[PDB]
Design a protein around this ligand. Structure first.
Ligand code: K
Ligand code: K
Lengths: 343, 343, 343, 343
């Protein structure tokens, strides 16, 4: 269900992308002039934004900042500095700083610092074991091919390189054991590979799970707060739901729900309003749920539900939905009649 | 066990596969004439089916449709259009549309939109981070080999390409740092690799997990309606069972359970009938469980239980089976006497 | 710890491995005569074993069999047949059958069948999605390089091959887009790669998790069944322990616990006996636990605990151990005083 | 946050790394003289420490050792032996032993032995299955290319090598099916690959998870013990917290909490002291928590909290924090007043 609410999503990211677009030599006149010019203007928009932030201390209702400001500070100062110090050639390198911006929207890095942090004593141990494993292999591979390939196994670092290629799963094809036994040794190498392949894996596995778990405070602590519905529940029931709860702003003109289109979930409205294409034009206010008969029934969208405007929405899975109907019979009853209003 | 169980599974899939067989130049023979003709006939079968769906509004007693119809509409209209608009040599491209059909029987894509959707703000950030990482690497690799390989590192996009090959774990072997330091840098590239290799991973891991979760809850609900047995239980106990419950439809002639053959689980019958090769011919009706003494005992299939006909079966794990025997001692008692009937 | 513990593990496996050692042409004298001869003798030993099983209805202590016998039947008949039917030089191919044997001691394949089976309706869909994804890529890649490489992209299957190389993470290096855009297209391909990389993964993730889950049936009877200790507990407490419980059979002469050697767990004895190197020689009978002061204290092995003989041991985690001590104060008291006996 | 926190971490690791730096041929005098000499001195420092451990029976107040000592013994004796036995040019190989040390601070290897150990019966079966799969492929690949590439597929081991390259996801590029059908067979090979790719995976997945689970006794059993806070809770609540609890030792001069800097957690002090940059200079004693208003509020670090000295800190997640405040309202109340002192 994507039309325009991620309106903000729709227009800032591109500035970050254009950095790559410019990056090319042996380039013609028609595209280079426009693109190079655009970054200076984007830069200026951000520069204007900075004056507001450094200078201004009001955001609306609630907000907090510090290292985050530092990130923004670095982002604007660097491209500027490139412009100033460098009256010369490549300084577009300095522009790259844009990519710093997207990290702000995620639940990852300052937290990653925290999580990477609490297990630095062990995770580091795994990688060190890794450097070590690379070392023993270099010794093994080198002895078999030193005389035959002074050219390729001439040295430990040459052997070390092959370990690098072989260890990860890349295998370039330029260097290989010409002799029969070396191939046999690689057989052992293949076995150490299972473990190795797994290491690449340990790092992201903990990080993604962590990062997702973290969004629970932003997305699933604050978000839970607007829906008054969430309050009947205490700490144990809420966390399972918290892992489950999902966000997304739908806007002006978006077809939230297509009429006729399957709805295997229901939507809750936090902010903004939505419109229902039905018998009695229903505009939905905060504390509203729609497509609920979708679940009672197990069928579609009741109406074309189109976001009246920019609206933040929460959706509920069938497993979770039974919990809400059971927790509050009154709520099951309301979903059905409101659904009657919705359908 | 498989014989003619998903009778339906056995037949439709082949039409989807034939698209690949046809797709060959420098072709001759008996093979090309038959195959090209078959797609038009398959198209016609589906075309006939479409008239039925567009025209017909009765399905028995269990269905709902909309975007799904749209998929079917696209599927038939496209190969049709190629036939009409194109009197031209290549229109078999348009036929490919068949592969759209398999998505229909999965728990994934409409659902995928919901998963990918609720975490689009975090998930895309990781990939954007990926473009970023790729960029810095292009810079580092390019500086090392620009003079040496105007031919290979002639430009950022050339460097960028190497980052693509190297980042994933593919490594073609046509480009590499000739110089020693470059090889050393690749050592750093290798450590960034763990993170990288992991990204490829974050995407399917979440999708498969959800996809299975989506199908399972519905399957459990269906089993509960179908198996009266499921009703004693409330929302908390059923979900664990729901992840566990599993289904297929055995048919005519399938030997559901080989006699003598180990049975480490038992089967429940939702629809259809089954036949038991035992002292008293036993045909099993709905609400029937068999091979239960298999579990009480911990041994095989009681009988050659062959599907009397097309039958939908559910199987229960030993861990789960204890829960059913303990929840209802009456049920445990029944499993043993019926088992006496079954064995 | 290992000495001759799985006395059985030590000897049968080698016969399975020897199949590979023989497999070499341009072979000479001393190795070939012995190795070829050995398989016939191993075959004969198995043939004798078969006569016993086909003709024998007695057991060491409780068993069940049917499809398993069929596996054994196929295993001996094939190398036999090769011997008889083939006076021909290559029939060692038929010998390979040995590898069928190891599947017998695992918790996987009959189970894999049932599990793969209950989700063939969806796992197959993912792979099908894979064949189709492969198809769109072949079309895309072919278009860019048809004129340039009639030799490499001369045909869809030629393009299809590259999709195979690229899709998995192998990348041979013999084929690549010569032109700039193809490399750009490969950029999209790289992104579709993450999804693909994940598919390879979806299959094992379900199988390994489950295969381990399955051994619970063997494990519960094995540790829970012979340790009277396990009976205080009911179905909910046991399963968590069940995932946790672990086993091996130590033998004659094995030093179960090195004396002075850290013991981060304790061992339970199901079958066989063990000896303790301490003030009072202690031989441990069934229903015995040792190295428990290792946990109360959090320090090593009390004594060199050496398996008096072939013994089946279960070990308990510190997390689990607290549950045992808390569930039964009397048990906590016994562990310390017995420990006094052990230390 | 990191400054001189693990003071110890900062110094020992480098000695381990230096082994790689020295290991280079075609080297020059300026770098080589210093580096070669450093290992002898590092060796001597370790030699000194060993005499202390060998001849000493005290330290701090709570330790145990045996196999661990054996590791240390092997570590010093080896480089010594190389020095003594070998007046010879290459003995730096013997020095490598340093890397043995890192395993000491991890929760993995003795324990890995423990887990690998209770699952030798099942992991081994999969790996052997792997050799088996490799065998069938060597047979199939060899038949297609024996005449064409006596040079590449001349033998099963030559075919076997390709199986190694192909099986893992490396693909060098030197040996490929020239013929069309092999390319088709490779299509089957690609499918068996998913299964293959997964094997590499089963090994690290269980190992990392268990390894992390293991630090629960060191880090989350005895270590938690210093927070009196942990006592109210019983065995079930603690384990969830135990997986969650995390540690580092900040030192002299580290700014624990940047002031202004987001604090999305709070820190507990086990050992050492910390200083708070606020209205009342606050030095924090053991049993202290800071940045708690960070959670009540959901905003940063109250103060620049800088480690007064070497301090061991525990940090608490928001999900966990709610449990703490709810378990003891008295504690919630204390967090806010202390927070008043901290802020
Ligand atoms: K590769
Ligand atoms: K390659």
């Amino acid at each position: 269900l994507r039309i325009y609410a991620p309106l903000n999503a729709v227009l800032a990211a591109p500035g970050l992308l254009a950095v790559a677009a410019l990056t090319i030599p042996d380039m013609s006149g028609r595209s280079r002039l426009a693109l190079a010019a655009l970054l200076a203007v984007i830069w200026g928009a951000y520069l204007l934004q900075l004056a507001a932030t450094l200078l201004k201390r009001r955001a609306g209702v609630v907000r907090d900042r510090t290292p985050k400001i530092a990130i923004d500070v670095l982002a604007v100062l660097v491209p500027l500095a490139a412009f100033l110090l460098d009256g010369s050639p490549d300084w577009s390198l300095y522009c790259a700083v844009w990519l710093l911006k997207p990290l702000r929207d995620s639940t990852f890095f300052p937290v990653l610092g925290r999580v990477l942090a609490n297990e630095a004593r062990n995770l580091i141990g795994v990688t060190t074991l890794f450097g070590v494993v690379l070392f023993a292999v270099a010794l093994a591979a080198y002895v078999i091919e030193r005389d035959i390939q002074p050219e390729k196994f001439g040295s430990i670092p040459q052997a070390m390189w092959w370990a690098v290629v072989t260890l990860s799963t890349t295998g370039y094809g330029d260097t290989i054991p010409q002799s029969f036994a070396g191939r046999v040794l690689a057989g052992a190498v293949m076995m150490s590979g299972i473990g190795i392949f797994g290491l690449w894996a340990g790092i992201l596995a903990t990080g993604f799970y962590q990062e997702v778990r973290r969004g629970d405070f932003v997305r699933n602590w604050q978000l839970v707060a607007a829906v008054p519905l969430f309050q009947k529940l205490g700490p144990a029931v809420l966390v399972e739901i918290v892992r489950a709860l999902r966000a997304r702003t739908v806007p002006a003109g978006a077809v939230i729900c297509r009429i006729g289109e399957p709805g295997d979930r229901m939507f809750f409205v936090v902010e903004g309003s939505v419109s229902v294409a039905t018998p009695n034009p229903v505009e939905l206010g905060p504390g509203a749920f729609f497509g609920e008969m979708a679940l009672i029934s197990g069928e579609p969208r009741s109406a074309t539900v189109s976001a009246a405007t920019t609206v933040s929405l929460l959706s509920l899975h069938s497993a979770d939905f039974q919990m809400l109907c059971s927790s509050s019979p009154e709520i099951a009853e309301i979903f059905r009649k409101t659904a009657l209003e919705r359908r």
